[PDB]
Ligand SMILES: C[C@H](CCC(=O)O)C(=O)O
Ligand SMILES: C[C@H](CCC(=O)O)C(=O)O
Ligand SMILES: [Zn+2]
Ligand SMILES: [Zn+2]
Ligand SMILES: [Zn+2]
C-alpha cells in the first residue's frame with residue numbers, strides 16, 4: 001500500500017507525477033556539513049531548492065526520487081526540510097555511487113548488503129528516514145568493487161522489495177553487464193531501471209534491454225551544452241546532443257512498443273560540488289526551469305509529435321508508481 | 332599563549348604530556364554517522380575510546396593531537412565527548428589525508444586554503460570547535476592535488492600560526508619533497524612535523540631534514556606485525572620492524588643532537604574502518620596499552636638506555652607545547 005519518503009509513508013496514489021532520477025544536492029559525504037559556504041550557505045541552498053521544487057510542483061510534479069547515495073553527499077535532513085517546505089514528496093536512496101571512500105571500498109559483499117539493508121529497514125543515519133530505492137553505478141566495465149556493490153544491491157532489493165536504479169556509461173552499453181550480474185542474483189528486471197540511457201542513441205541496445213523487462217531510464221533530458229561549445233568542462237559533463245534528440249528517444253521507445261518500460265526525469269540538482277566550481281551556475285543558465293523541464297518542455301514537445309496525453313501520464317504517473325511500490329520480500 | 336582544543340582554548344602550560352599524532356577513530360567522512368554499527372555502536376566506540384584515553388591519562392598523558400582530517404572521518408563531536416569523559420585534552424586537525432572525495436579533489440589551491448582557514452578560524456562544521464593543526468599527506472611523489480594541499484596548508488599556517496604535520500612514505504624520503512614545497516611557500520621548517528618518520532631506518536634522511544629545522548615525527552612506535560606473519564593485511568599495514576627498532580630511532584636522534592626537534596606518538600586508534608574489517612581487533616591484540624604505550628613502554632625503554640628524565644620531559648612536554656603554540 002505504501003512508499004517510504006523523507007516525510008514517512010505515502011500511499012501509491014499520493015505519489016502522482018513522479019520524477020524518478022533527481023538530486024537536491026550532488027555533493028560528497030560530510031561535505032555540506034563541513035563546508036556549507038561552498039553553496040553560499042545552507043540556508044541559501046535550502047531556499048534555492050524549495051523554490052525549484054515549488055516550480056516543479058506548479059508544473060504538476062508531486063514526487064521526486066533523490067538518487068543521491070551516501071558517497072554523493074546525500075543529506076536526508078536537507079531533503080526532509082526541503083520536502084516539507086515545498087510539499088513535494090521525496091524518496092531517498094541507499095546504495096553507492098562513483099566515489100565510495102576507503103571505508104566503503106574495503107567492505108565485503110556481505111557487509112555492503114548489511115549497510116544497504118540498514119538504510120532501508122532501520123533508517124538513514126539517526127533520522128529514522130528509510131530509503132525507498134537502491135542506487136548503483138558503473139562507468140564502463142565494472143571494477144571488482146562495483147561488482148560487489150551490484151550484488152549487494154540485488155540482495156538488499158530481494159530482501160526488502162525496494163527497486164534498484166543505476167548509473168551507466170550508456171555508450172559503453174553498461175546496462176548489459178549490470179543486467180547479467182543482477183540476473184545472476186535472481187533479481188527481476190522489472191525492478192531495475194538502467195539509468196542515463198538517454199546518453200546514447202543506440203536504440204538497439206535500449207530496446208534489447210526493454211524487451212527483457214528492464215526499465216529504461218531516460219533521465220537527463222535537459223542535459224546539453226549546445227551554445228556552450230567554448231566551455232570544456234560543461235561540454236564534457238552535459239554532452240553536445242540536444243534535449244530534442246534525447247527527448248525523441250522517448251518517442252522512439254513508445255513507437256517500438258516499449259512505453260511500459262520507460263521512466264523519464266531531468267537528473268537535475270540545486271547544488272553541485274563534486275565537479276568544477278562554477279557548474280551549477282552554468283547548468284542553471286542552460287535550464288532555468290530545472291526539474292520543471294520534463295512537464296513544461298518535454299510533455300508539450302511529445303504531445304505535438306502525436307504522443308497522446310494518456311500515454312504521457314502513464315509514463316510519468318503509473319510507470320513510476322509500479323516501479324517504486326515495494327514488492328514482496330523473498331522467503 | 333593559547334592552543335585550541337575540542338573543549339575550547341587552553342594555555343600552553345595546561346597541555347602537559349602530549350601525544351602529537353593520534354586518532355580517536357580512523358574512518359571516512361560521514362561514515363560513523365551513516366554506519367555506526369560497523370563499530371558495534373556509537374556508544375560502544377565512545378566507551379572504548381574513553382576507557383583507552385583514561386588508561387593513557389593514568390599513565391601521564393594530558394593531551395593528544397587527533398590528526399584525523401575531514402576525509403579520515405574526523406567527527407569533532409565524538410572527539411569532544413571522549414575528551415570530556417576522559418579528562419584528556421584533544422587538539423583537532425584540518426587539512427586533507429589520503430582519501431579526499433570528489434568535492435575536495437576538484438578544488439583549487441585558493442579554495443582549499445579557504446576551507447582550511449574556515450576550520451581554524453571559524454570552526455569545524457557547526458560545532459564552533461576550531462582546529463589547532465593542519466594535516467597533509469603524500470605516498471611517494473606528490474600527485475598534482477597533493478601539491479595543492481601542501482601549498483594550501485602552508486598558506487593557512489602562515490595566516491594563522493598553527494603548525495603543519497605530515498603523513499609520509501618515509502622510505503621514499505617524502506619529507507624532502509614536502510619540505511621543498513613548503514619552503515617554496517615561505518613556510519618555516521620549525522612549523523612543520525615530518526611524520527611517520529619512524530617507518531624508515533635511514534638516519535641520514537632524518538638528520539638532514541632536522542638539520543634544516545624540521546621536527547621529526549616518530550609517531551608509530553607500537554606499529555609492528557611481529558608474531559602476525561601469517562596475516563598479510565596486518566603485516567602490510569604495520570610492518571615487520573619491531574617497536575624496539577622504532578624506539579631506538581628516538582635515542583639515535585637524541586644522540587645526534589636533535590632532542591629539541593623530536594615528536595613521539597603511537598598513531599593509535601580506537602575505531603578503524605578505512606582498512607580491512609578485523610584490523611582494530613588485531614592491533615588491540617598486540618598493543619593492549621593503546622595510546623598508553625609511549626608512557627608505559629617507550630619511556631622506561633629509553634630510561635634504561637640512559638636517556639635522562641629531563642630529556643624525556645623535553646620531548647613529551649616542551650617540544651609539543653612549542654610546536655602547537657601559534658607563532
Ligand atoms: C548532474 C548529475 C548528478 C550525478 C549523476 O547522475 O551521476 C550528473 O549526472 O552528473
Ligand atoms: C593507524 C593509522 C591511521 C592513519 C595514518 O596515520 O595514516 C595508520 O597509520 O593507518
Ligand atoms: Zn549518474
Ligand atoms: Zn543523477
Ligand atoms: Zn598517516
Ligand SMILES: [Zn+2]
Pocket residue numbers: 352353354398598
Ligand atoms: Zn595517523
